[PDB]
C-alpha cells in the first residue's frame, strides 16, 4: 500500500511557568513510534512501537541530540514570532510543525511535506517543489527571507528525498507484520427506535487499521450525506480505530437503507443492512 512518515513538533510558550515546552512525536502512517518531551524528568527519545526498539544506541543518542537542540531553537523561534506579531510577553503561543515523506504503493517518493503553524493558523509551508515557500502573512515573510538566506529548502529537500525515504522503508520492513498489514473493519448495524414513526440505524466499523475509512448510508441507492451523523474516527487503544454513521429513518422503511464500507483491508467494499 501507500505509506508515509511524519514528525509532529509542538513548541508552546508559557510565560510565568518556565521555558517553552517542546514535544516531538514520530509516526509511520497511523502508528506512533517515538516521542520526546522536554518536560520529561529526564528528556530523551523514547520508543513507542516494538519495531523501533532494535535501533542501536547511536540512533537514540542522535535523535535525542536533535530534539534537545530543537528544544532550544524553538524557544528562540517563539521569541522571534512574538516579535513579528508585536505580541506582549504575557501570552502563551504555539508553533507547530509537521513534516515528512509519502511513498506510493511501489516504495517510490510521492511527495514531501514541511508545514508550520503559529497559534493554530497556517504560517509557512514548503511547496511541493521542495524548493520554494508559501508564507501566510508578512510575519512569515520574515521567516521565509531568513530560510531563503540559509538554504533551508535545499537541506529539507535532501532530507525528504533521501534519509526520510530510506528510514521510512527501513521501518516498513522492520515492522512489516503490522505496518504493512491492513486490518478490515468488523461491521454491524444497530437499530434504535427514537419514536413511533422513526428509528436510528447505526452502522458500526470496529477494529480496523489504518484509520482511513469511508462509511456512508444510502436510501434507495442515493447517498444521504446531509442526513447522516458521522462521528470522528477514534482510536481504540490497541492500534485499531472505530467509527460509526447514523441515520434516522421512517419506521418500516429500514430496508430501503444500506450502509457502505470502504477500507484498504477490504478486497470487496461492504454493503450492509439492518438484520432484525
Amino acid at each position: 500500500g501507500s505509506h508515509s512518515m511524519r514528525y509532529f513538533y509542538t513548541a508552546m510558550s508559557r510565560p510565568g511557568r518556565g521555558e517553552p515546552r517542546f514535544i516531538a512525536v514520530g509516526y509511520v502512517d497511523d502508528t506512533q513510534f517515538v516521542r520526546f518531551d522536554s518536560d520529561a524528568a529526564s528528556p530523551r527519545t523514547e520508543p513507542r512501537a516494538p519495531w523501533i526498539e532494535q535501533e542501536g544506541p547511536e540512533y537514540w543518542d542522535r535523535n535525542t541530540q536533535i530534539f534537545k537542540t530543537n528544544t532550544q531553537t524553538y524557544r528562540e523561534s517563539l521569541r522571534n514570532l512574538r516579535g513579528y506579531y508585536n505580541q506582549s510577553e504575557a501570552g502563551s503561543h504555539i508553533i507547530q510543525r509537521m513534516y515528512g515523506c509519502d511513498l506510493g504503493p511501489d516504495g517510490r517518493l510521492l511527495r514531501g511535506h514541511d508545514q508550520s503553524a503559529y497559534d493554530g493558523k497556517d504560517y509557512i509551508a514548503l511547496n511541493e517543489d521542495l524548493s520554494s515557500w508559501t508564507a501566510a502573512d508578512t510575519a512569515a515573510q520574515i521567516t521565509q527571507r531568513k530560510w531563503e538566506a540559509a538554504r533551508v529548502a535545499e537541506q529539507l529537500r535532501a532530507y525528504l528525498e533521501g534519509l526520510c525515504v530510506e528510514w521510512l522503508r527501513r521501518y516498513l520492513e522492520n515492522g512489516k507484520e503490522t505496518l504493512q498489514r491492513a486490518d478490515p473493519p468488523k461491521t454491524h448495524v444497530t437499530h434504535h427506535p427514537v419514536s413511533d414513526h422513526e428509528a436510528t440505524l447505526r452502522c458500526w466499523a470496529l477494529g480496523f487499521y489504518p484509520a482511513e475509512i469511508t462509511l456512508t448510508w444510502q436510501r434507495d441507492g442515493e447517498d444521504q450525506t446531509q442526513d447522516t451523523e458521522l462521528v470522528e474516527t477514534r482510536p481504540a487503544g490497541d492500534r485499531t480505530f472505530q467509527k460509526w454513521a447514523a441515520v434516522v429513518v421512517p419506521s418500516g422503511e429500514e430496508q430501503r437503507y444500506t450502509c457502505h464500507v470502504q477500507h484498504e483491508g477490504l478486497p470487496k467494499p461492504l454493503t450492509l443492512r439492518w438484520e432484525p
Binding site: 540512533y59 536533535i66 532550544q72 531553537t73 522571534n80 530560510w147 538554504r151 537541506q155
Partner: peptide
C-alpha cells in the same frame, strides 16, 4: 529518523 535541522531552522 528526524531531520537534523536544529542548527538552521530558526524561524
Amino acid at each position: 529518523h528526524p531531520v537534523g535541522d536544529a542548527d538552521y531552522f530558526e524561524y
